[PDB]
Design a protein around this ligand. Structure first.
Ligand code: NI
Length: 341
């Protein structure tokens, strides 16, 4: 049945709640972003109103075939009224089209649902600055102090410099990048830009990217693999067997592969700096795991919450075990006592 942490009290609303059938008393279904664990259940047969960003609504129409009459896109940073309740969508710094949602309840309670987010100091200057938030539905993916990672900028600098060195040393090397959802487009687009190449990919993946309002995208991507020296493949194929196989398909155009797997966190991070990352190598194939995250580190999450000073926190991630739930509640109490709210 629909868990309580997907329901917004005092409304008829649910968030990311498409896999439970008809939720009793739900008049509007919000969708924070187009990742499968969140849209699970949507299809061309859905007949209730879906509220989301413009980019999410492009993906609903083109990839899942949801009928246009039930898609309600909203502009960001704009006060809108939905079934009698004021709401605002804010950029979540997650994947393309991902939002956080501010609800202004009729009794005067203000609720923020972060969906999935990577907290940033820039959020402290959005419309969140303008009023008090009473309850926070929080993306707690990495809510423990072991989760540190570098900035997205430092990670992209490493990837660009690695790729450019490799291909300048060997003009017959191929660069491969893995993907299994939207997000992390900067990785492959930044590497193709430094090499003077388009990124080549499957028809399905090109279709997905053409939904994302990225500027000048027709200049950066292609379905012609032959004209490209940066290839995108399914994440599953980023292993020695998969890459050896792919290399055979390129008909002797290339004699080396340099491959990137943008993982979330990996315990090489507790010790190793970004400067110090090394690949796994077999023969003429090397694979780099790079810590490009689209979720908050522990420290970023802690700063956002200590700035916002919510009266109540409801975690949305890692809620299935008692030990996880107890640990999270302990950090929330620490943060509150350190900051004095
Ligand atoms: Ni997500």
């Amino acid at each position: 049945t629909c868990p309580f942490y997907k329901k917004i009290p005092g409304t008829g609303f649910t968030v990311d709640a498409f896999q439970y059938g008809v939720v009793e008393g739900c008049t509007a279904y919000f969708l924070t972003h187009f990742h499968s664990d969140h849209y699970a259940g949507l299809s061309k047969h859905f007949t209730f109103p879906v509220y989301c960003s413009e980019i999410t609504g492009n993906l609903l129409k083109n990839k899942l075939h949801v009928q246009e009459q039930y898609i309600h896109p909203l502009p960001l940073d704009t006060e809108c009224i939905v079934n009698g309740v004021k709401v605002v969508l804010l950029d979540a710094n997650h994947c393309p089209g991902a939002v956080m949602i501010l609800f202004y309840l009729p009794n005067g309670t203000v609720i923020l649902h972060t969906g999935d987010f990577r907290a940033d100091p820039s959020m402290e200057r959005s419309l969140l600055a303008d009023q008090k938030v009473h309850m926070l539905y929080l993306d707690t993916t990495y809510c423990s102090p072991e989760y540190t990672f570098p900035s997205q900028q430092e990670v992209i600098r490493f990837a660009i410099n690695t790729a450019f060195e490799a291909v300048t040393l060997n003009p017959h090397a191929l660069v491969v990048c893995g993907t299994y959802s939207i997000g992390k487009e900067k990785v492959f687009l930044a590497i193709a830009d430094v090499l003077g190449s388009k990124v080549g990919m499957s028809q399905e993946k090109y279709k997905t990217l053409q939904c994302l309002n990225i500027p000048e995208i027709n200049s950066l991507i292609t379905t012609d693999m032959c004209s490209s020296l940066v290839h995108l493949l399914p994440m599953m194929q980023i292993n020695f067997k998969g890459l050896q196989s792919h290399l055979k398909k390129c008909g002797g155009k290339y004699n080396q592969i340099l491959a990137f797997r943008p993982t979330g966190w990996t315990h090489s991070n507790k010790f190793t700096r970004i400067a110090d990352v090394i690949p796994q190598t077999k023969g003429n194939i090397s694979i780099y795991g790079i810590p490009y995250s689209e979720h908050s580190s522990y420290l970023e999450m802690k700063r956002f919450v200590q700035w916002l000073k919510p009266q109540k926190i409801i975690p949305t991630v890692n809620v299935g075990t008692w030990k996880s739930r107890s640990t999270m509640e302990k950090y929330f109490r620490e943060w509150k006592l350190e900051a004095g709210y």
